[model samples]
Target: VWKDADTTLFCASDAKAHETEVHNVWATHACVPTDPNPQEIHLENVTENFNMWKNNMVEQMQEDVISLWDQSLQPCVKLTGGSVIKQACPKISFDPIPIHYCTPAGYVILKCNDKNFNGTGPCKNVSSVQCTHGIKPVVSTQLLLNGSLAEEEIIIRSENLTNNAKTIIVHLNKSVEINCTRPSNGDIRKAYCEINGTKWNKVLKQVTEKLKEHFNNKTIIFQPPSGGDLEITMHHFNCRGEFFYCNTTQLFNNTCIKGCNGTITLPCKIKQIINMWQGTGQAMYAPPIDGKINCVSNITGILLTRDGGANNTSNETFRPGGGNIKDNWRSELYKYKVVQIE
Candidate 1:
């Protein structure tokens, strides 16, 4: 017998028949749960997910396809041609003209013969002494890279031939020849060529030397004022940080007393100090009453000065020499010093 929450099967035997005999009772049950969870094995199915995977596959394949195209197909399209122009005449000759006798102008003349021709003969005479050959001038420009013309033109001009000179030109139609080779069973086709390596190496060396000479003549230097340490800190062109100092002296025994040295802490300060010297040469001394010493500090666009050191010996005046110092008179002997702020 089978049983479940909604369905059950049971097997029952007759209990009250004569002597109750309970035989084997069998039951089975089957149930469906109300809230069953399903297992998740993959990412969420979104439109963008499919599109992203498709794009990635496309890009990977594109790179491989392009590489295959270049290796197997591109090299076969390289432009090549045969000699397109030929020269048939000699311009110079070793033999000199006979004295008092010039070659006849219109008469057919043979100058020389080469492997290409049996002999060189005049095709026409344009002047009494000048003759031209029938050989026609031919030239062809090679089209490259999807029919785009080359940036530079190749010109081959041939004329007047000489006994010692050899000139030859041949013209042929430009065409691309495919050379295919397979290194492995499934490998793509590859094309290559090799020519005389000597000429190419020599030309490359010449080009490199010319480039070195051109760069050697170039000038590189750091300009002043614009390249100073102070200018670099200001971020831009600022003239406020520049400063100058000056001093005056009187004749005292042909010597003047040493002026005071004071420090100016400001932007663009111009300071001047004056002292009087009398007496004579080396024996000169400082005069008691000397000319005024003007110390100007151009801080904040204003001129600040400390007075002369004449009136008070113990008192140091800020009018001419002293600022940030207690005794101005002691600093008056020292000329000037400049200080800057951050």
Candidate 2:
């Protein structure tokens, strides 16, 4: 945890040394701890130790270099025909495996020739070297003409032949027809026809329908599964649905009548009044307009008892019931205000 200006010293001591008092005196050189700190300097012995360490390092480095050379460069020696100094372990035949032959941009015609030593000019006869011993000859000629096959088998026919009134004619149709003949060994089961170089399918109708559905209105085409006639075409359709309804109401009403009591009128008898009470009873017979709708049922049965209504009949008389009448009247007024007859 503590860093020194030049050299950091760390030690566990029972007491701090006064100004300058040496206890152990362990030292290191160049930021590296030197074990068994040098008590005395012996130049010759140090030089010998340094040389031996250097020699051992060089020997190890040399071994690593040799190992890498063997791994990387040894395999290529066989390709270049370099003499490998290792003792032969086993003989291997590479004849059955094809050899890779390459050339630096030149035309090559490969031919094998077995010329007898009868003083003949190196098999000058082209027919002798052409397709001999059942080995195929490959001729690489430039600027080849059309209708020329890369390889051809010669058919031999006798020029002079006795005519016994025999004739053979091959009839060809206008449309191209390929006749696939089975081998002369009588393997008729192997014979098959390919239409435009493809096998036929029996489920052609179903396959064609599926393909038409998949590729309808598309320009790309595909082959139907086996034994099919390629004549079906597909048409595509595009369609989509929509819908909409609403609900509302309007109402109105009127009344008229005549009465007496300061020129009373039936329509005037029931006047429309809007009351917006904050806490409670402000108007007994008006329509509530904009306050919280208070239920009148909870206070309906509350008795209005007078304290001094005792023995005297007149004193004992009481207002029968006005329990929640005020609030109920207000609610009824509101209902009337909103109710429509027509």
Candidate 3:
């Protein structure tokens, strides 16, 4: 065992070179009398050879980008333990697999995708594995209007997701599944149990319908999974009727008008709702203090109201009326009143 302490002979070439150099003199002198001064052997850098082999392996593996049609030759598979195929191929880093590679466990064989020794590979016989089928979970959205489904069957496929907010417009009792499945092996799958409207979704749907009537021809868009919550934004459009109302004070007052406009953003999660308001030019009001909306619902339906506090001294509301009024009379307010549609 002639061991080169600092060198690693990983590839076959390193071993052959080491063997050749150590014995080339043997053919000349069956066995030369051991010389007095045994010259120090100049060892080849076998470590460099191993590193070169690894670089070639990875470069070759990545260069051979397999098309999706050849599932058997795909470069990588996620293992049953949620690891990638490259983990078994210590020296070679594999390229990304296709998005459709997302799958259940142990559905595909594992082998080094790179061709080696007689077309054999290092990661041979590692066992079968799986890979992520897609980038995101299936997101299903439905819209309910006044306790009735206004729309359903809205879906965003995982392949198209980039982990950001999605804007879906419809008007909801809603249920959410944390993880959803996709069609596999030419067969579509279904959820295990039935999902129905949640209390929060019921009020949200009612709010959307009532708000739509007052909306100035602008459609309401519901943004969701935004910070993991649902956001309803009714943007800057004028109301059709006497929907415009304002008070220098916070309480409901008779200082009302018609065709006024503003932007209302309501973000809700479960039973909690936050109301954010921005007043229109005609409304001459500061953005109302952000707070929770009051939710009142019964067999008839739901009503959402928010008594946004007084307009006071802020960058947007700086005026001579800079004092923050501390009473209910100065409380700004917004209320929605409607009965369930029959």
Evaluated with lDDT, which candidate comes out highest?
3
TM-score on alpha carbons, each prediction: 0.12, 0.10, 0.14
| 176-272 per-residue lDDT for model 2 (tens digits) | 2212222234222222211221111111222223323333322212211112111101000000000000000000001110221121111101111
Model 3 spans > 4 angstroms off = 1-192, 203-342
Residues 89-132 of candidate 3 have per-residue lDDT tens digits of 11121122112111122222122221121111132222222221
The Cα error of candidate 2 at residue 216, in Å, is 88
Top-TM-score candidate index: 3
For candidate 1, write residues 1-342 as lDDT tens digits.
Answer: 111011111111222223211110100011111112322222122111011111222232233223322222211122224212222221111110101101122222111111112112221211111111111000001101011111222111112211112221111112122111112222121212111223322322332233233235222111111121221111111011111211111100111113322221122212111110110111111211122212211110000121233233432111111111111111110111111111
Residue 147's C-alpha lDDT in candidate 3? 27
lDDT of candidate 3 vs native?
0.19
**Candidate 3, RMSD to the unseen true structure:** 31.2
Candidate 1: misplaced stretches above 4 Å? Answer: 1-186, 217-342
**Candidates 1 and 3, the one with greater lDDT:** 3
Residue 137 lDDT (model 1): 9
Ranking by lDDT: 3, 1, 2
